[PDB]
Design a binder for these strands. Structure first.
Ligand SMILES: Nc1nc2c(ncn2[C@@H]2O[C@H](COP(=O)(O)OP(=O)(O)OP(=O)(O)O)[C@@H](O)[C@H]2O)c(=O)[nH]1
Ligand SMILES: Nc1ccn([C@@H]2O[C@H](COP(=O)(O)OP(=O)(O)OP(=O)(O)O)[C@@H](O)[C@H]2O)c(=O)n1
Ligand SMILES: [Mg+2]
Ligand SMILES: [Mg+2]
Lengths: 736, 49, 135
RNA sequence: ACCUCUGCUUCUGCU
RNA sequence: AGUAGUAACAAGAGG
C-alpha cells in the first residue's frame, strides 16, 4: 500500500476537508535581491494592455503618457484597458438611480471629514516614499520632512493643523521655481528643478511583495509619497462611504460580517427568483485588476458621484485621479552583476538603466530595458495607465459593483438576470434564467459589459456551477460557510511582542479559533500545551523546577526556590501553565492574582518599574500581526501592564550611514515630547489642540499648577516661589 | 570594463522528475514507532465536563 | 462563581449576528466616555464644555472616588476606563443566549457538535431578562 | 595585518 | 561547493 492523503476526498467533500489543501506549516515564498525586474514587468504589461491607445508627451514632466480610454473596442479575450467613459457613466448613473440620496449622503460625510481631519491623520500609513530624501521612510517621518521642506520654501497653510490646508500647500508647491532640500555628504543645500520636484511628487516607489502564499512567482507593489496620500485618502473615504450602503459590496466588512452579508445575498436572490429558474454562481476573479484600472476613468467616476456638490470639493477629490494619471514608478534597487573570472560583484542602480551598456544583461532583461527606455524620465518610469496594486480598492470596488447592479430584471428585461457580491477584483456572480442558454447569454452580457469598463474576468481562475457551493476569498460555501482552520495556522505561535502581550495573544488566538474556525476542544487543549512550550523556549522562561541550562536559568531558579506560592508565578517568571479551555479569556495576571506571594505581586506590578514603555492610550495593548493572507491587522489584547510588558531593542544599522543624524533628532524630539507630557498628562490620551508653542503652554501650566498647589497646601511657599522664578528665567533665556 | 561582468543567473529551475523514494519516505512518515517523540507541557486541571 | 451542567451533542445552526462583548459597560458613546474620562483622570485639561448627563456625573463621582491616590499610570487607567465604559460589539456565530456574559464564554459553551450548559456567576441585567421574557 | 561599527534600515505598500 | 531560484546569499561598511 502506498499512502495517498488525497484519497480522503473520495469520501469527504472537498470543502469539508479543505484545510488539508493549505500548506501553511512551512515558510512562505520570499524574494531575494532586486524588485526592478518585477517593476519593469508591470510597467510593460500595463502598457501592453492599453497599447492601441493614444500617446502624448506631458507638458510638465515630459513623460510619455498612454491613454486607452474610448480606444478601440476589444477584439479578443486578452486583458484590455480600453474602458469607455460613457459606459462607466451609464453604470454609475445606474447606481445613483438604484440608490437615491446615497451619493449625496456619502458626499456630505466626506465634506464633514474634509473639514475635521487633522494633518496628523497621514501619520497612520506604513513605509512611505519620501521625496525629500528619494528613499522610503515611516509615514510620520515622511510627513514631517514634507512639512519642514515646504515651510522652508514658503508653504505653511498646514500650520492650521487641518489636512485640507496641507493639501493646498501641496498644489501650491508645484508653482515653485526650485524647491530647496538638504543632502548629507555634513550638509548641502540642493535645489530641485520645478520638473524634478514634480516628478518626485508624482512618484510611487516600488518593491516586491514577500511572504505571499499560493503563487509560484513574485510581483511588485508600490508606495506613494505624501503629496499623493492625503488626496487618495479622501477619495477612498468617499468610496468607502458608498460601499457601506451597497448590498453587493464586500468592503469594508470583515470576516464574520462578510460571511453574513454573502449569506444574505444568496437568500435575497433565491427569494426573488421563480421556482422555474436555474441559478448558477461564478466563483470569480479578474486578470490583472490593478493594471487595467484607469485614473482617467476614476476621474470620471469621482466627477459623476459628486455631481451637484460644491466645486471646491469636486476639484479636491479629482486631485487623486489626476495625480495617478500623471504618476511615475521608481524602478527599484537596480541589479547586481558578477565576474566569474575576477571573482567580483557590483551594484548598478535603476537610474543607470537609462544609459548603461546592454551587454551586461540576460536576453529577457535586455528586452525589458529596451521597452522601458522611452518611458524613463529622471530615473523613473512613466505609467499613465493602471492604478498599481491596491491604490483604489474601494473606488475600483464601486466600478465592479456598478456592473453587478446592472443585472436587475427590470433593467435588463432579458431571459436572464444577475446579482452578487464584489470586493476589489474578487466576486461571486449569481446568474438566473429559464434555460442553460439564458445562463450562457447572461454570463456573456456580464463579461462583455465588464470589458467595456476595463474589467477582465480571469477565464482560467474563474468557474461556474449551480448555486449552492462557491468560494469567495478563501471562504468556502457548501450550503453555508464551512471552516478553514489552516488559513490561521501561522497565527499559532509566539507573536514576538513581549512576554505579557504574547501570553494574551496566544490564548486569545486559541479561543477565537474555537469560536470562528471550528477548532475542536481536544486540539484547542493541545494548542495551549504547544504554545506554552514555544513561549518557554522562546523567552527562556522554563519552569523553575526544570534542569535546562539557559542564560536565565539561575535567576529564575532563585525566584522559584524563594517563592512560597509557586502556582502564582507567571509562566515568564518560571511558573506553571494555568490555562485550560474554560479560562482562555482571563489575563494571566488576573488568573493568578489570588495565588501570588504579595511581594512578587507588588514587584511585578510596580508602576515605577523601568521596563514598561507606555506611549499612547490609542496604541495601548495593540499589536500588529501579518495574517497568512491580506493586509497587516492591528490586534487588541487584554493584559495587565507589568515588568513583562517590556520593549525589545531597536535596529542600529543606521549608525553606519549618512542618516545617523536622524537618531539624534528623534532623541531630541522625544525628550521635548516627554517633558511636555509631564505638564499635560491628558496628551497621552487625546491629542492636545493649540497654535501656542510647546514652551508657552508648559510655562502657563507650571505657573497656574504651582498656584493651586500653594492654596491647596500640596507645596510650600518657598518651593512655589522657585517654580515661578525658574519660569521667569526660562522666559528670559528664550530671547537669544 | 570586465568582459565577463554579467547579471546574476536568473533562470527557471532545472526540471526533475518523480522518483520512488519520496513516496517511500512518506509511507514511513505515516507509521507508528515504538517511541513517544512528543512530550507535552501541563494544562490547568479539567473542571468543565 | 459559574455553574456547569451537562454537555449535549447535536447539530445546530450558529447564525452570525452582532452581539455585545463587554459586560459592565455604561452604554456611553465614545464622546461621552472621553468627556467622563477627562473629568475623572485629567480634570483640569477638560476645556470649555462640561457634562450634561446625570449618568455621566454619578459615574464620574464613583470612579473619581474609587481611584483617588491611584499610582498606576494614567494611560492604563484611561485605557481601561475606555474599554469598560463603551459598549463594544462584534459579529460572531452564535446559537444560544446573546447576552455579553454568555458571549464572553462562547468558546466554552458552544462547539460544532456540542453545547456545554453553563451559568456565569452574578446577576442578570433587568434589560436582558425582560428581553428574554418577551421572546 | 590589525581595528571599529552593523545583523529588518538605500528594499516590506494599499481599504 | 552549497543554499537557493527569474535574484540574491556565500558577510557589509568604515579605518
Ligand atoms: N488590497 C489588497 N487586496 C488583497 C490583499 N491580499 C489579498 N487581496 C485580495 O483578496 C483576494 C483573496 O485572497 P485569497 O483568496 O485569500 O488568496 P489568493 O491566493 O489571491 O486566491 P485564490 O485564487 O483563491 O487561491 C485576492 O485575490 C485579492 O483580490 C492585500 O494585501 N491587499
Ligand atoms: N497583496 C495584494 C494582493 C492584491 N492586491 C489588489 O488586489 C487585486 C486583485 O488581486 P489578485 O487577483 O491576486 O491579482 P490581479 O492584479 O488581479 O492579477 P491576476 O489575478 O491576473 O494574477 C490586485 O490587482 C490589487 O489591486 C493588493 O493590493 N495587494
Ligand atoms: Mg485577479
Ligand atoms: Mg483576486
Amino acid at each position: 500500500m502506498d499512502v495517498n492523503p488525497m484519497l480522503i476526498f473520495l469520501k469527504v467533500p472537498v470543502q469539508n476537508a479543505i484545510s488539508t489543501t493549505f500548506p501553511y506549516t512551512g515558510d512562505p515564498p520570499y524574494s531575494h535581491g532586486t524588485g526592478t525586474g518585477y517593476t519593469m514587468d508591470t510597467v510593460i504589461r500595463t502598457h501592453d494592455y492599453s497599447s492601441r491607445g493614444i500617446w502624448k508627451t506631458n507638458s510638465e514632466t515630459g513623460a510619455q503618457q498612454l491613454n486607452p480610454i474610448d480606444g478601440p473596442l476589444p477584439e479578443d479575450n486578452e486583458p484590455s484597458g480600453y474602458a469607455q467613459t460613457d459606459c462607466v457613466l451609464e453604470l454609475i448613473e445606474g447606481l445613483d438611480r438604484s440608490h437615491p440620496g446615497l451619493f449625496e449622503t456619502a458626499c456630505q460625510e466626506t465634506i464633514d471629514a474634509i473639514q475635521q481631519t487633522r494633518v496628523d491623520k497621514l501619520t497612520q500609513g506604513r513605509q512611505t516614499y519620501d521625496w525629500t530624501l528619494n528613499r522610503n521612510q515611516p509615514a510620520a517621518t515622511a510627513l514631517a520632512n514634507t512639512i519642514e521642506v515646504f515651510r522652508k520654501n514658503g508653504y505653511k497653510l498646514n500650520e492650521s493643523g487641518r489636512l485640507i490646508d496641507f493639501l493646498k500647500d501641496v498644489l501650491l508647491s508645484f508653482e515653485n521655481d526650485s524647491m530647496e532640500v538638504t543632502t548629507h555628504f555634513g550638509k548641502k543645500r540642493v535645489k530641485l528643478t520645478k520638473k524634478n520636484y514634480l516628478i518626485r511628487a508624482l512618484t510611487l516607489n516600488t518593491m516586491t511583495k514577500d511572504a505571499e502564499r499560493g503563487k509560484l512567482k513574485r510581483r511588485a507593489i508600490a508606495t506613494p509619497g505624501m503629496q499623493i496620500r492625503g488626496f487618495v485618502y479622501f477619495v477612498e473615504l468617499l468610496a468607502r462611504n458608498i460601499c457601506e450602503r451597497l448590498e453587493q459590496s464586500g468592503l469594508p466588512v470583515g470576516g464574520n460580517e462578510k460571511k453574513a452579508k454573502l449569506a444574505n445575498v444568496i437568500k435575497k436572490m433565491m427569494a426573488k427568483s421563480t421556482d422555474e429558474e436555474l441559478s448558477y454562481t461564478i466563483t470569480g476573479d479578474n486578470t490583472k485588476w490593478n493594471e487595467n484600472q484607469n485614473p482617467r476613468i476614476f476621474l470620471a467616476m469621482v466627477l459623476r458621484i459628486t455631481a451637484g456638490q460644491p466645486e471646491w470639493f469636486r476639484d479636491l477629490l479629482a486631485v487623486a485621479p489626476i495625480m495617478f494619471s500623471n504618476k511615475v514608478a521608481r524602478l527599484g534597487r537596480g541589479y547586481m552583476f558578477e565576474s566569474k573570472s575576477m571573482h567580483l560583484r557590483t551594484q548598478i542602480s535603476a537610474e543607470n538603466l537609462s544609459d548603461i551598456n546592454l551587454r551586461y544583461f540576460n536576453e529577457d532583461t535586455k528586452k525589458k530595458i529596451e521597452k522601458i527606455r522611452h518611458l524613463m524620465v529622471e530615473g523613473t518610469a512613466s505609467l499613465s495607465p493602471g492604478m498599481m496594486m491596491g491604490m483604489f480598492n474601494m473606488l475600483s470596488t464601486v466600478l465592479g459593483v456598478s456592473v453587478l447592479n446592472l443585472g436587475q430584471r427590470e433593467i435588463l428585461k432579458r431571459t436572464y438576470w444577475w446579482d452578487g457580491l464584489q470586493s476589489s477584483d474578487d466576486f461571486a456572480l449569481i446568474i438566473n434564467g429559464h434555460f442553460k442558454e439564458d445562463i450562457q447569454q447572461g454570463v456573456n452580457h456580464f463579461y462583455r459589459t465588464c470589458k467595456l469598463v476595463g474589467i477582465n474576468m480571469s477565464q482560467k481562475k474563474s468557474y461556474i456551477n449551480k448555486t449552492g457551493t462557491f468560494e469567495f476569498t478563501s471562504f468556502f460555501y457548501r450550503y453555508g460557510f464551512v471552516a478553514n482552520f489552516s488559513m490561521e495556522l501561522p497565527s499559532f505561535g509566539v507573536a514576538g511582542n513581549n512576554e505579557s502581550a504574547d501570553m494574551s495573544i496566544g490564548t486569545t488566538v486559541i479561543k477565537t479559533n474555537m469560536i470562528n474556525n471550528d477548532l475542536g476542544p481536544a486540539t484547542a487543549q493541545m494548542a495551549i500545551q504547544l504554545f506554552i512550550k514555544d513561549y518557554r523556549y522562546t523567552y527562556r522562561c522554563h519552569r523553575g523546577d526544570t534542569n535546562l541550562e539557559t542564560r536565565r536559568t539561575k535567576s529564575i531558579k532563585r525566584l522559584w526556590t524563594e517563592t512560597i506560592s509557586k502556582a502564582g508565578l507567571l509562566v515568564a517568571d518560571g511558573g506553571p501553565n494555568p490555562y485550560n479551555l474554560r479560562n482562555l479569556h482571563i489575563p494571566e495576571v488576573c488568573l493568578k492574582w489570588s495565588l501570588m506571594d504579595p511581594d512578587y505581586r507588588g514587584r511585578l506590578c510596580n508602576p515605577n518599574n523601568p521596563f514598561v514603555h507606555h506611549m499612547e492610550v490609542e496604541s495601548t495593548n495593540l499589536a500588529v500581526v501579518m495574517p497568512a493572507h491580506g493586509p497587516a491587522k492591528s490586534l487588541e489584547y487584554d493584559a495587565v501592564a507589568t515588568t513583562h510588558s517590556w520593549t525589545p531593542k531597536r535596529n542600529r544599522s543606521i549608525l553606519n550611514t549618512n542618516q545617523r543624524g536622524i537618531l539624534e533628532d528623534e532623541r531630541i524630539y522625544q525628550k521635548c515630547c516627554q517633558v511636555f507630557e509631564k505638564f499635560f498628562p491628558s496628551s497621552t490620551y487625546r491629542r492636545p489642540i493649540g497654535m501656542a508653542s510647546m514652551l508657552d503652554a508648559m510655562l502657563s501650566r507650571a505657573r497656574i499648577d504651582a498656584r493651586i498647589d500653594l492654596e491647596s497646601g500640596r507645596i510650600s511657599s518657598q518651593d512655589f516661589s522657585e517654580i515661578t522664578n525658574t519660569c521667569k528665567a526660562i522666559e528670559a533665556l528664550k530671547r537669544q | 570594463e570586465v568582459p565577463d561582468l554579467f547579471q546574476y543567473k536568473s533562470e527557471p529551475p532545472e526540471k526533475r522528475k518523480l522518483a520512488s523514494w519520496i513516496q517511500s519516505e512518506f509511507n514511513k512518515a505515516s507509521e507508528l514507532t515504538n517511541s513517544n517523540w512528543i512530550e507535552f507541557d501541563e494544562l490547568g486541571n479539567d473542571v468543565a465536563p | 462563581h459559574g455553574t456547569f451542567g451537562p454537555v449535549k451533542f447535536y447539530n445546530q445552526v450558529k447564525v452570525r449576528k452582532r452581539v455585545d462583548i463587554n459586560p459592565g459597560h455604561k452604554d456611553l458613546t465614545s464622546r461621552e466616555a472621553q468627556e467622563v474620562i477627562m473629568e475623572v483622570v485629567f480634570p483640569n485639561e477638560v476645556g470649555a464644555r462640561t457634562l450634561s448627563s446625570d449618568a455621566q456625573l454619578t459615574i464620574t463621582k464613583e470612579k473619581k472616588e474609587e481611584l483617588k491616590n491611584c499610582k498606576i499610570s494614567p494611560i492604563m487607567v484611561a485605557y481601561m476606563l475606555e474599554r469598560e465604559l463603551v459598549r463594544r460589539t462584534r459579529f460572531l456565530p452564535i446559537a444560544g443566549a446573546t447576552s455579553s456574559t454568555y458571549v464572553e464564554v462562547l468558546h466554552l459553551t458552544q462547539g460544532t457538535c456540542w453545547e456545554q450548559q453553563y451559568t456565569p456567576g452574578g446577576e442578570a441585567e433587568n434589560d436582558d431578562l425582560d428581553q428574554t421574557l418577551i421572546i
